[PDB]
Design a protein around this motif. Structure first.
Motif, PDB file in Angstrom:
ATOM      1  N   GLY A 158       0.816  -1.202   0.000  1.00  0.00           N
ATOM      2  CA  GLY A 158       0.000   0.000   0.000  1.00  0.00           C
ATOM      3  C   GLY A 158       0.858   1.265   0.000  1.00  0.00           C
ATOM      4  O   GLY A 158       2.047   1.277   0.453  1.00  0.00           O
ATOM      5  N   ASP A 159       0.268   2.342  -0.520  1.00  0.00           N
ATOM      6  CA  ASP A 159       0.937   3.664  -0.626  1.00  0.00           C
ATOM      7  C   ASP A 159       1.254   4.185   0.778  1.00  0.00           C
ATOM      8  O   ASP A 159       2.275   4.829   0.978  1.00  0.00           O
ATOM      9  CB  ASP A 159       0.089   4.671  -1.394  1.00  0.00           C
ATOM     10  CG  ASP A 159      -1.365   4.808  -0.932  1.00  0.00           C
ATOM     11  OD1 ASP A 159      -1.860   3.953  -0.148  1.00  0.00           O
ATOM     12  OD2 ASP A 159      -1.993   5.775  -1.370  1.00  0.00           O
ATOM     13  N   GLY A 160       0.374   3.858   1.732  1.00  0.00           N
ATOM     14  CA  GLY A 160       0.574   4.108   3.149  1.00  0.00           C
ATOM     15  C   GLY A 160       1.799   3.403   3.714  1.00  0.00           C
ATOM     16  O   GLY A 160       2.702   4.044   4.197  1.00  0.00           O
ATOM     17  N   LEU A 166       0.015   0.040  -4.475  1.00  0.00           N
ATOM     18  CA  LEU A 166      -1.433   0.269  -4.537  1.00  0.00           C
ATOM     19  C   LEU A 166      -1.778   1.695  -4.074  1.00  0.00           C
ATOM     20  O   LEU A 166      -1.928   1.951  -2.877  1.00  0.00           O
ATOM     21  CB  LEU A 166      -2.142  -0.744  -3.642  1.00  0.00           C
ATOM     22  CG  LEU A 166      -2.092  -2.209  -4.071  1.00  0.00           C
ATOM     23  CD1 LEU A 166      -3.455  -2.850  -3.887  1.00  0.00           C
ATOM     24  CD2 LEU A 166      -1.651  -2.365  -5.506  1.00  0.00           C
ATOM     25  N   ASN A 209      -4.213   4.216  -3.412  1.00  0.00           N
ATOM     26  CA  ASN A 209      -5.618   4.457  -3.134  1.00  0.00           C
ATOM     27  C   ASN A 209      -5.739   5.684  -2.222  1.00  0.00           C
ATOM     28  O   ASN A 209      -6.726   5.817  -1.502  1.00  0.00           O
ATOM     29  CB  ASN A 209      -6.284   3.239  -2.476  1.00  0.00           C
ATOM     30  CG  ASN A 209      -5.409   2.642  -1.396  1.00  0.00           C
ATOM     31  OD1 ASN A 209      -4.468   3.300  -0.941  1.00  0.00           O
ATOM     32  ND2 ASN A 209      -5.697   1.410  -0.997  1.00  0.00           N
ATOM     33  N   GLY A 242      -4.384   6.576   0.571  1.00  0.00           N
ATOM     34  CA  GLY A 242      -4.293   6.512   2.025  1.00  0.00           C
ATOM     35  C   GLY A 242      -4.574   5.139   2.595  1.00  0.00           C
ATOM     36  O   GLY A 242      -4.514   4.118   1.903  1.00  0.00           O
ATOM     37  N   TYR A 243      -4.863   5.118   3.898  1.00  0.00           N
ATOM     38  CA  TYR A 243      -5.030   3.913   4.658  1.00  0.00           C
ATOM     39  C   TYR A 243      -6.454   3.358   4.496  1.00  0.00           C
ATOM     40  O   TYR A 243      -7.299   3.525   5.392  1.00  0.00           O
ATOM     41  CB  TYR A 243      -4.756   4.191   6.128  1.00  0.00           C
ATOM     42  CG  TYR A 243      -3.438   4.845   6.479  1.00  0.00           C
ATOM     43  CD1 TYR A 243      -2.275   4.630   5.748  1.00  0.00           C
ATOM     44  CD2 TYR A 243      -3.328   5.594   7.646  1.00  0.00           C
ATOM     45  CE1 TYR A 243      -1.061   5.170   6.151  1.00  0.00           C
ATOM     46  CE2 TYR A 243      -2.126   6.137   8.058  1.00  0.00           C
ATOM     47  CZ  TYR A 243      -0.983   5.929   7.306  1.00  0.00           C
ATOM     48  OH  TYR A 243       0.194   6.491   7.721  1.00  0.00           O
ATOM     49  N   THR A 244      -6.683   2.638   3.388  1.00  0.00           N
ATOM     50  CA  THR A 244      -8.007   2.214   2.938  1.00  0.00           C
ATOM     51  C   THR A 244      -8.556   1.128   3.853  1.00  0.00           C
ATOM     52  O   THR A 244      -9.723   1.169   4.180  1.00  0.00           O
ATOM     53  CB  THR A 244      -7.995   1.743   1.476  1.00  0.00           C
ATOM     54  OG1 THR A 244      -7.736   2.866   0.630  1.00  0.00           O
ATOM     55  CG2 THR A 244      -9.286   1.075   1.046  1.00  0.00           C
TER      56      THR A 244
HETATM   57 MG    MG Z   1      -3.230   2.759   0.849  1.00  0.00          MG
END
Ligand code: MG
Ligand code: TPP
Ligand code: TPP
Ligand code: MG
Lengths: 532, 536
Positions: free
Chosen positions: A412-414, A438, A440, A442-444
């Motif tokens: 994740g991007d986070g 990924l 998205n 932030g913290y999806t």
């Molecule tokens: Mg994310």
């Protein structure tokens, strides 16, 4: 003929197939690190921080069997603790060697803090016992598959020991089982298989690393009992086996699976972490524990009688899954539920697949693996940022096992932000993983639990495409994909399928998008008075 | 009229001038976290990792008195612990709140859910695990006071199932008591009488301002002692900024054997050392500590420096009556002019920085060459130094810079935060630049590009692999982390450095900036270089 105690440690590690040493230099280890380059085939990764170095260590050990990270007294060792702790939690053998000073006060405080997350600790004081102490630490790391803390005073490292000490191997063998206790387990287990009409096998993560992956397939082959994996055990069973049923995630298993297990009158739980559990150190049958009866031997003896006791069992059918997506338009926006199915199309035999805590973790439990696929997902400890470091370690180890072998991260991007700098040491070593980020915004996964719009689920937006060049890469690929067609065009490109350079693939996804059985999950948790 | 326990905490922190909350969300701090937005004048920083958050909490607390970092059970708090330990070593007041599970994941597979609490207990002034709503308010207050007054990390564990239980809002109307208990009278008098006696009999007294000078609220006292005695006054590297360096009696930095010859001689020739805010030749040393004072081997525990100095000041001039002021050392404060092409060298640069700084500047220097170089820079008055010399955790300054900048913003937006960090150190914590960008904070980031770990090269393995680093594009860090409003420039020469640092636009913190300072790999401040060559 005389070598430094330094050289002795690295020659020892070399003999247990540990070629890469993680960590960072400091005052009290510099003398020790010199010795690395006196042992052919050994290297210093030169990590970008100690937390990352321990995650890499973890990664390395998962593929290679054990690992070593070296840090410095205080500042180094404390930075690594979350890494060490995760290795302890998930049973990864990481030797943590701390260079310490010559032999508020309390120079022991850090040693005590690491004791909490270590299988054993040594503080070497004595040039004469040091060789046996190193040897005992390595054995314990390997056999227990848990972190070990070795303190090495800076004044003993360049003290010399007889080179011919290296001529007695370290004993990496298990001590056998008490036959009587083991015969008891086998007896009982065999009785349970004789009665049951509908048993399943569950493989947990310990299959791969404790080598009961081979025992596990034979149990399947000899029983034809349907066989499932936990998220952590995914890869432990080759998924093209007729009797592979899929991933048991409990409440979140695809429906077929969910009930498929739940409908079973006997569960044979392997590598686990009317039921039988085979653990590395013990086994349990129903309520009754049996300490000491180790799965390796226990399971070996079980295989010789399992056909007999299962004489009569009629092979139950097993969950198929929609191996492939439907064709859709090239302009179609990427969705998580499409992506994890499609990722099946791209995997090959021998791939190492690493998935960060987040959507990726849930996502990959929906992907079909080919055979000989080595899964890494830190579902127990669950520390975001792990996978960046783990990717480096795994990519080193996979380099030393087989250059063909591809390393594929889903992060994740986070999660990327916590450990992003370890991309640097991938580049410095010319390692060639596939970094699927990924994006998205932030913290999806947390947006899915609490605060869809809360600022603490928002992150600063990075230029992923520029990471690689910023960290000094001269031969790389960075590409963004937002659509079906972009995904297909990139991933069915044969050029792309060859681990020929380090690659970053930025995967543009809605912010609230997620795998369907994480989605429903919180559709269920947000409508319920079941709580913490 | 009731508030959640979570809200209670943030309201208590607002009262003690804590506006910016560090940490990362997770697992068991989410509904604690919501409460931040319910209190006006509070913000969640949104750090890029827990280690960096801790260093940031440290930086923030150094300016604002105290700080708060919030992490999650296991994965969060273990990530922070190296920052926590530095704060404990350097006596910085960080309240570490950990969102913990209600009273099965991020677990060690073993049974011990207290294991992380225990690990943190070794580097905490005190701990509380909160379990009872009834004592929850008082426990929080005790934790806050302890953090502020002892100036050391405190551990505060907050079960998730308690953070949204309510408590009376009226509890907030009782201030947290942050005053020191007055000294013991008998003890304080024996201290005073003795120090006064020594001062009478000293031929060559000297004042040493160590680390706790500013942080334990003693800068004014220390200055009044210089003024009232006229003794020479020196700082330790940690203390630097404790004494306004324009004072005529300011003789410089005592870096022990790495001092200037005059400073070394001026200090070691003393027959009495008045040391202020120590955290621990000749016998006659008086140490003024936060918690105790020490005269030679004799300790007076619970005789605090704040009050003890205040009493000393009322008699000290009488004692110093027959003192004759020695002239003090000084470093030339200006470089001799050179051709604009002269490539940058450390010795030149640390003096030159001198020409750039102004009053109110926060100067932050990283462990490595910078921490040593900064010691030859002449400070303007009211300059606050941060240099983590005792704990010496490289990477620290990246977080500490963020934290300092938040705190500076809240105290005075005109105030400049200036970081000297090595290329090496920057890698460990590079990402916290993201958090600065996010909040439109405008520190100067001087990155010394000497192609690896120079201080290590100097001590062992000049060209060894482990002293080498991957070379990054320092000028692209800012845009890569999404910066839209920034400056990034490289300086290789004196003319170039002069051009940038004398520029009108550069000299106000109108945006975040990265200055890539290109230095030779084996170049360092002369003290250090007369050490490698001497103790090869
Ligand atoms: Mg994310
Ligand atoms: C060190 C650490 N800090 C915080 C957490 C809590 N946490 C769990 S998932 C998550 C967000 C992950 O975000 P991202 O990686 O962007 O994944 P997404 O769900 O967006 O794909 C956080 C903050 C953790 N598990 N470990
Ligand atoms: C967390 C941590 N890791 C490692 C060390 C050991 N150490 C001290 S200084 C240093 C290198 C500093 O290099 P750089 O920041 O580039 O400074 P330079 O000396 O090159 O100016 C290292 C690795 C430490 N003190 N703390
Ligand atoms: Mg450097």
């Amino acid at each position: 003929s005389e070598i430094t105690l330094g050289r002795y440690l690295f020659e020892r590690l070399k003999q247990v197939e540990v070629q890469t040493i993680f960590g960072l230099p400091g005052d009290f280890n510099l003398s020790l690190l010199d010795n690395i380059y006196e042992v052919p085939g050994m290297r210093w990764a030169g990590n970008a921080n100690e937390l990352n170095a321990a995650y890499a260590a973890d990664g390395y050990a998962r593929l290679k069997g054990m690992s070593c990270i070296i840090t410095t007294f205080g500042v180094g060792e404390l930075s690594a603790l979350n890494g060490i702790a995760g290795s302890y939690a998930e049973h990864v053998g990481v030797l943590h060697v701390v260079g310490v000073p010559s032999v508020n006060g309390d120079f022991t405080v850090f040693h005590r803090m690491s004791s909490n997350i270590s299988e054993t600790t040594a503080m070497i004081t004595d040039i004469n016992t040091a060789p046996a102490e190193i040897d005992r630490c390595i054995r314990t790391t390997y056999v227990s598959q848990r972190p070990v803390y070795l303190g090495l005073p800076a004044n003993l490292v360049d003290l010399t020991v007889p080179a011919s000490l290296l001529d007695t191997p370290i004993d990496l063998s298990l001590k056998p089982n008490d036959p009587e206790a083991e015969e008891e387990v086998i007896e009982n287990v065999l009785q349970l298989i004789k009665e049951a009409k509908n048993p399943v096998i569950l493989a947990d993560a310990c299959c791969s690393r404790h080598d009961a992956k081979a025992e596990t397939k034979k149990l399947i082959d000899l029983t034809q009992f349907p066989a499932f994996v936990t998220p952590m055990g995914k890869g432990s069973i080759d998924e093209k086996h007729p009797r592979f049923g899929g991933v048991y995630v409990g409440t979140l298993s695809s429906p077929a699976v969910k009930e498929a297990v739940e409908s079973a009158d006997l569960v044979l739980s392997v590598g686990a972490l009317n039921i039988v559990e085979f653990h590395s150190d013990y086994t349990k049958i129903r309520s009754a524990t049996f300490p000491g009866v180790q799965m390796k031997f226990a399971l070996q003896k079980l295989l010789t009688k399992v056909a007999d006791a299962a004489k009569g069992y009629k092979p139950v059918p097993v969950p198929s899954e929609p191996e492939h997506n439907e064709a859709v338009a090239d302009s179609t926006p990427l969705k998580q539920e499409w992506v994890w199915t499609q990722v099946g199309e791209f995997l090959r035999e021998g791939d190492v697949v690493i998935t960060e805590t987040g959507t990726s973790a849930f996502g990959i439990n929906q992907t079909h693996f080919p055979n000989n696929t080595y899964g890494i997902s830190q579902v127990l400890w669950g520390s975001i940022g792990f996978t960046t470091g783990a990717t480096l370690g795994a990519a080193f180890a996979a380099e030393e096992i087989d250059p063909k072998k591809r390393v594929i991260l889903f992060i994740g991007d986070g999660s990327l932000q916590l450990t992003v700098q370890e991309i640097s040491t991938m580049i410095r070593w010319g390692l060639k993983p596939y970094l699927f980020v990924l994006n998205n915004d932030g913290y999806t996964i947390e947006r899915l639990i609490h605060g869809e719009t809360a600022q603490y689920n928002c992150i600063q937006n990075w230029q992923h495409l520029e990471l690689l060049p910023t960290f000094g890469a001269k031969d790389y690929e960075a590409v963004r994909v937002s659509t079906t067609g972009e995904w297909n065009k990139l991933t069915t490109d044969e050029k792309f399928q060859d681990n020929t350079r380090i690659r970053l693939i930025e995967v543009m996804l809605p912010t609230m998008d997620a795998p369907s059985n994480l989605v429903k999950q919180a559709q269920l948790t947000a409508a319920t008075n079941a709580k913490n």
